[PDB]
Amino acid sequence: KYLVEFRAGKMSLKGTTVTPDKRKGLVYIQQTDDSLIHFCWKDRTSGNVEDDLIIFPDDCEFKRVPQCPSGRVYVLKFKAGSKRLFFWMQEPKTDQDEEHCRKVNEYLNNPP
């Protein structure tokens, strides 16, 4: 039921300022027993699930934010309200970053 998983931190908004959260994290996509698809973020130290968003095809895109040199930053963009959530890849190698991005989009928008 865990379709996609990868190490990544999240970010926080205070006022109008986006600040990366340094917590070790895991982004994952889980299909639940009702067949719904959840985009989740959990704290890898505590096991605390902080983000849990039910996403249907065409609701979202997940994309690299290429202009940031200080991390491998990705954005989960919602059509609804132009809402954005930022994540930053935490695997020590970058080899699988684009693959993880591809699989997020696949399972949210065009699953097997």
Partner: peptide, 7 residues
């Protein structure tokens, strides 16, 4: 510090 996304 060491950077926003650095430990």
């Amino acid at each position: 510090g060491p950077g926003s996304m650095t430990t």
